[PDB]
């Protein structure tokens, strides 16, 4: 129901997210990208696959370029974006959500 990783708790249904229980906002583009990643734990997703999975009934997949959304999301959930733990890169493939 609520995805939990690190100090985060994410509710895919309501789009509510918390950092150590303090409410944090997810723009449509961040949410669309985070949801795709989080709902496919350990499945590396190409940028194309991400873009396709991010599409919703609202303006989201077209908000920003995948890499930038990824960069933005890493700034929000990683202790060190340069060495991400949750939103990782799979060389020659794309990106992957690693749970825990």
Question: Would you summarize the structure shown here?
Answer:
It is found in: Cytoplasm. With 100 residues, the chain is of the alpha+beta class. 31% of the residues lie in helices and 23% in strands.
List its salient traits.
monomer, 100 residues, alpha+beta, Arc Repressor Mutant, subunit A, 4-stranded antiparallel sheet, two-stranded antiparallel sheet, 3 helices, 31% helix, globular, DNA-binding dual transcriptional regulator OmpR
Q: How would you explain this protein's 3D organization?
A:
Keywords: Activator, Cytoplasm, DNA-binding, Phosphoprotein, Repressor, Stress response, Transcription, Transcription regulation, Two-component regulatory system. It is found in: Cytoplasm. The chain is of the alpha+beta class. It has a single domain, classed as Arc Repressor Mutant, subunit A (Orthogonal Bundle). The chain contains three helices and six strands, in the order ββββαααββ. It has a four-stranded antiparallel β-sheet, with no helix packed on it. Strands 5-6 form a two-stranded antiparallel ribbon. The longest helix is centred in the C-terminal third of the chain and has 12 residues, at 66-77.
Element order, helices and strands?
Answer: EEEEHHHEE
How would you describe the shape? Answer: globular
- Which architecture name does CATH use? Orthogonal Bundle
CATH homolog superfamily: Winged helix-like DNA-binding domain superfamily/Winged helix DNA-binding domain
**Biggest sheet layout:** 4 strands, antiparallel
What is the domain tally? 1
Q: What structural class should be given to the helix and strand makeup?
A: alpha+beta
Number of helices: 3
Strand order of the largest sheet: 1-2-3-4
Protein name: DNA-binding dual transcriptional regulator OmpR
Subcellular location: Cytoplasm
DNA-binding region: 1-99
């Amino acid at each position: 129901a609520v995805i939990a990783f690190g100090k985060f708790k994410l509710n895919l249904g309501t789009r509510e997210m918390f950092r150590e229980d303090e409410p944090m906002p997810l723009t449509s583009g961040e949410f669309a990208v985070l949801k795709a990643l989080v709902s496919h734990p350990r499945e590396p997703l190409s940028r194309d696959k991400l873009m396709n999975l991010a599409r919703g009934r609202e303006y989201s997949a077209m908000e920003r370029s995948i890499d930038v959304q990824i960069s933005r999301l890493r700034r929000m959930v990683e202790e060190d974006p340069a060495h991400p733990r949750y939103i990782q890169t799979v060389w020659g493939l794309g990106y992957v959500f690693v749970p825990d």
